[PDB]
């Protein structure tokens, strides 16, 4: 259950999200977004 | 990794960068799953940043500004078709909503999928 | 097929799970049935001794209802607006004795608040016609129980619940509050349903611990027992109730999950609120004024009763030779019929010879009294089986009682016969 | 908190209730001006200190639990940021 | 202020985002039917009831109407204060509400089904008022033009109505492009304006 | 791992064998030193323990 | 269920991410961390001492856990240890980059 | 943990006795630090 975002994405707004998904979800599941997120950003740049 | 999440949202041009004369003397892809449409990417059959429409069944949850729609088209045996800017709602005289399409780039679905995946897929393992 | 309690009854509709499982409740290793008397929830997998507790229902906070016990009232899933008119009648209602008036008026308000769990789940909660509760009943049940001080206090309870709806709901009320109990069979509906299935247990949500009454989902599925498999737990991490297996025990598939909902406590209470009686409530009273005494020791080694007085126990590796007449009811009568015990000297067997037929005459006594006899109820029983399912609970209160009064003559008699060995 | 807040006849925070986002913004609308907090110059001793006058922990989001070095953490708190 | 409580049972109730408006409802079988001679408007959810502004000539008789919604979904983040907490909330927030007289006063079943686009009637939520659409035909045919073959188009907050012939109908693409021409380019004059070559420049 | 000569001889054994590693009671030599050091300039440091159970106090070395 | 997810899921179980799962359940259940660590210590202690020969590639904090697990309805398999399935031969090593 | 000659000499007059209630002392020591693990409860 995600927003869908229809706009760019920055360091704060990182920040932001890192955040609010580690209140809602917990510590271990964030740990495992982020490494999937890592992977992403590698390829693409 | 921040270039790259930059990158992937950015956008396209959306006006006189895009079209150089005005449009009205005068995008196409639409898709049914995200599935396709990242298909289409790897096929080259499309860019990233090209635009394309995909049908969305789930319940309105794109961020967007709070504004009222373009252009409201009304047919006589009921239907109505509703344009804002980044989708169209189309409705019925029972006033169900029969379809809601959404304006995007590839980008963006793909950032969406790896967030979604990667939540089901530590539920499906802990199991 | 294999013969287990759950293959009886039937399976339930999808739906009953599916409006909790996109919440966020998660059920292990059960299921849950369907029969004539209404839902109940029952094992699908085998599970051995254990070291430890196993979880079975994980229930989440924002699926319940709940309120504080002491004065400030806090309502902690919070579904209330500020400013609302509700807040003033739930407020003018004594702090100590009521409280199942608070919790039926939060109900009510959850019914007409959209998107609330409630909503949806109340459609799958018993109806007027299929709750026991004995607020729901006529002058006519309440005669057929067949004892005035029962029937009395539930006449009083039902007279409170007018009131309550005749001067809160008045004419001049706005429009929001009169929605949400037009009829006022509708405020007892909502009584009935927190007192048959309301919770107390202690909270802690963030740092604030509390004693709170609250209505929780999924787990009034549960019935009792006196002999329980189950027990109720808050995890403060997450938020959430969860219900657990007893540590040490094993389970079958096929059998009752079950659990105990309030202890040390008699066949009168059971009645009032829920409308349910049992053949065997080890702690009911029969009440001799007769003089004589047996024995105490002695009737505990009969029939094999080991444990302290508050707890008392069958020990059944002693009964090698299955048996089977000891039950709750032996043990209630144990708590029950005076006695005498003294230093170590042992009893006279003629002496006591006196006192069971004494006290024998006291039990014949006691079911020569009332109107008909333990074979006589059975009939009428038999008779209708489709019949307000109130009444059947009268009855039945009765049979009971009866068949307790006639246990203990059996078993003083046993007594008699084991003195001498 | 260390005592209640109201608004009219309704309990908006119980004492002993931790503040979070959400309880703050509702202090805010509804303009509750005097809040009394516990805070570590309300404890009644200087070589320790007590859980609920510390608060939340910042790392995991609860309270504190004891057996904590509060002092270790501070001071490392305020240097840290020094280097820029 | 009326001064009597009214039945509301008897009244179709539309709700705006900071209104809520009633109109009276004669008894029919599939619910259509309208009496604009007694309407109230009240605060959002709260029963003192009040008269509308009515700002145009408004139906003396029966009229078999349908209606649509104007409005703005507002999506917005919540702060998140417990483990589960919502991450979203999404709100449709209502502006106007547009009732259109079926033709003939006809009923939906008919096969003869059509609307009568020239008699549109608004409620506005901010000024708690109702009045009547101005609509301009733009499709030849005359006052007996076929009513199988018409589309309304509203444009302008919903304030412009007109109504064409359907196959000229634009497409969904065009719309949005359409629009975006005309604000980007409005946009680089201005940034452009402030240089000093820009009278003797040219637009390519 | 450093300056305690009887226990750092025996974790290497323990963990050849396969057991387990008990925790150290006395002093490393760090502190050793401090006292021989202090007892030169004429001061004397001692460290005792007393029971919780029956109040005796104990002098370690 | 998505379609295509099968090899996360794979690397997952196979990247030893399963015991960070479940070591965050099982503080779920408990106000003190500390306390905690200071279980789960002694029990391996007891073990150790009891059966000294049987570990050394399976470690015993990591039995205390699976345990735990399994007890309360979770398969895990013992010691969260995996055999590799495609290794060469003897004397061969997987170079993990 | 600055002036250690001062400090020292005033107390070794004073004869004074530290219950070892802090972190660093017990560091000293090569004892068990009274915090988290330690600190026992």
């Known amino acids: 259950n995600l927003v869908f975002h229809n706009k760019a994405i920055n360091g704060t707004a990182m920040k932001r999200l890192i955040s609010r998904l580690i209140d809602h979800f917990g510590m271990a599941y964030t740990s495992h977004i982020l490494d999937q997120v890592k992977t992403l950003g590698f390829q693409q740049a | 990794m921040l270039i790259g999440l930059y990158v992937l949202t950015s956008g396209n041009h959306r006006g006189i960068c895009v079209n150089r004369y005005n449009p009205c003397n005068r995008k196409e892809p639409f898709f049914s799953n995200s599935y396709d449409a990242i298909g289409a990417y790897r096929q080259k059959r499309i860019n990233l940043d090209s635009p394309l429409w995909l049908r969305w069944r789930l319940d309105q949850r794109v961020i967007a500004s709070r504004e009222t729609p373009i252009e409201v088209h009304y047919e006589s045996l009921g239907t109505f078709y509703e344009i804002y800017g980044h989708y169209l709602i189309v409705r019925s005289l029972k006033k169900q909503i029969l379809f809601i399409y959404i304006r995007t780039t590839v980008g963006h679905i793909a950032l969406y999928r790896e967030i979604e995946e990667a939540i089901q897929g530590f539920s499906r393992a802990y199991s | 097929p294999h013969d287990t309690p759950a293959s009886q009854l039937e399976l339930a509709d999808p739906d009953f799970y599916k409006i909790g499982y996109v919440r966020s409740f998660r059920a292990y290793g059960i299921e849950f049935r369907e029969g004539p008397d209404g839902y109940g929830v029952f094992a699908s997998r085998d599970v051995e001794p254990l070291r430890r507790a196993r979880v079975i229902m994980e229930i989440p906070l924002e699926l319940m209802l709940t309120i504080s016990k002491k004065l400030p009232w806090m309502f902690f899933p919070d579904i209330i607006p500020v400013g609302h008119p509700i807040f003033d009648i739930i407020n003018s209602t004594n702090p100590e004795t009521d409280s199942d008036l608070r919790l039926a008026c939060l109900l009510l308000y959850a019914f007409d608040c959209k998107d609330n769990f409630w909503q949806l789940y109340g459609d799958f909660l018993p109806s007027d016609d299929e709750c026991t509760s004995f607020l729901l009943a006529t002058e006519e049940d309440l005669l057929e129980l067949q004892d005035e001080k029962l029937a009395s206090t539930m006449r009083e309870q039902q007279q409170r619940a007018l009131e309550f709806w005749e001067k809160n709901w008045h004419s001049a009320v706005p429009l929001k509050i009169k929605r949400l109990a037009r009829d006022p069979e509708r405020f007892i509906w909502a009584m009935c349903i927190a007192q048959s299935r309301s919770i107390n247990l202690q909270m802690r949500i963030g740092a604030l611990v509390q004693d709170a009454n609250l209505l929780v989902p999924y787990a009034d599925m549960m019935n009792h027992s006196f002999q329980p498999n189950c027990f109720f737990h808050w995890r403060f991490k997450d938020r959430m109730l969860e219900v657990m297996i007893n540590a040490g025990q094993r389970i079958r598939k096929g059998d009752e999950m079950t659990v105990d909902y309030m202890a040390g406590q008699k066949n009168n209470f059971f009645m009032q609120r829920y409308g349910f009686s049992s053949p065997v409530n080890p702690w009911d009273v029969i009440h001799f004024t007769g003089d004589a005494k047996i024995h105490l020791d002695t009737f505990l080694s009969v029939f094999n009763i080991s444990g302290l007085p508050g707890e008392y126990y069958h020990n059944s590796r002693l009964s090698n030779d299955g048996d089977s007449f000891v039950d709750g009811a032996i043990i209630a009568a144990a708590r029950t019929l005076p006695t005498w015990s003294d230093g170590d000297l042992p009893p006279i067997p003629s002496l006591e010879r006196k006192a069971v037929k004494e006290l024998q005459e006291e039990c014949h006594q006691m079911l020569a009294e009332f109107p008909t006899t333990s074979d006589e109820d059975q009939k009428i029983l038999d008779s209708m089986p489709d019949c307000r399912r109130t009444l059947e609970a009268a009855i039945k209160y009765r049979l009971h009682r009866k068949l307790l009064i006639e246990k203990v003559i059996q078993a003083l008699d046993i007594y008699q016969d084991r003195i001498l060995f | 908190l260390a005592d209640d807040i109201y608004m009219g006849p309704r309990c908006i925070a119980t004492r002993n209730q931790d503040i979070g986002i959400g309880l703050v913004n509702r202090f805010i609308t509804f303009r509750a001006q005097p809040i009394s907090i516990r805070t570590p110059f309300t404890c009644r001793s200087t070589s320790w200190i007590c859980r609920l006058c510390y608060g939340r922990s910042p790392t995991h989001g609860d309270l504190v639990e004891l057996g904590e070095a509060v002092g270790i953490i501070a001071g490392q708190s305020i240097g840290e940021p020094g280097t820029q | ?204 | 791992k450093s300056d305690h000569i009887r226990a750092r001889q025996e974790v290497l054994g323990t963990t050849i064998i396969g057991g387990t590693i008990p925790n150290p009671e006395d002093a490393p030599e760090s502190f050793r030193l401090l006292v021989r050091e202090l007892r030169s300039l004429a001061l004397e440091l001692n460290h005792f323990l007393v029971s919780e159970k029956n109040f005796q106090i104990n002098r370690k070395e | 269920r998505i379609p295509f997810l099968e090899e996360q899921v794979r690397k997952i179980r196979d990247g030893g991410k399963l015991l960070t799962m479940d070591i965050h359940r099982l503080l779920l259940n408990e106000d003190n961390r500390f306390d905690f660590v200071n279980e789960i210590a002694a029990e391996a202690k007891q073990y150790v001492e009891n059966n000294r020969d049987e570990y050394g590639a399976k470690k015993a904090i990591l039995h205390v856990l699976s345990n735990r697990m399994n007890d309360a309805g979770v398969y895990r398999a013992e010691a969260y240890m995996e055999s590799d399935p495609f290794k060469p031969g003897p004397g061969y090593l997987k170079d993990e980059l | 943990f600055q002036e250690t000659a001062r400090v020292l000499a005033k107390a070794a007059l004073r004869g004074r006795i530290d219950w070892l209630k802090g972190l660093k002392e017990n560091v000293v020591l090569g004892g068990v630090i009274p915090v988290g693990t330690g600190f026992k409860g």
């Open chain 5, 1 to 204: 202020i009326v001064d009597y409580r009214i039945n509301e049972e008897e009244f179709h109730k539309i709700s705006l985002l900071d209104c809520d408006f009633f109109i009276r409802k004669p008894p029919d079988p599939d619910n259509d039917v309208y009496d604009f001679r007694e309407m109230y408007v009240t605060p959002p959810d709260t029963d003192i009831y009040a008269i509308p502004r009515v700002l145009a000539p408004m139906p003396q008789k029966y009229i078999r109407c349908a209606m649509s919604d104007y409005g703005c979904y507002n999506v917005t983040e919540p702060p998140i204060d417990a483990p589960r907490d919502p991450m979203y909330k999404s709100e449709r927030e209502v502006s106007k509400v547009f009732l259109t007289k079926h033709y003939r006063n006809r009923r939906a079943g008919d096969p003869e089904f059509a609307l009568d686009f020239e008699e549109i009637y608004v409620i506005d939520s901010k000024t708690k008022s109702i009045t009547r659409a101005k609509v301009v035909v733009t499709v030849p045919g005359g006052r007996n033009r076929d009513r199988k073959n018409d589309l309304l188009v509203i444009r302008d907050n919903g304030t412009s109505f007109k109504i064409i012939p359907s196959e000229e109908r634009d497409d969904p693409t065009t719309v949005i492009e359409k629009e975006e021409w005309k604000k980007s380019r409005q946009d680089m004059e201005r940034h452009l304006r402030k240089l000093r070559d820009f009278s003797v420049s040219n637009w390519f």
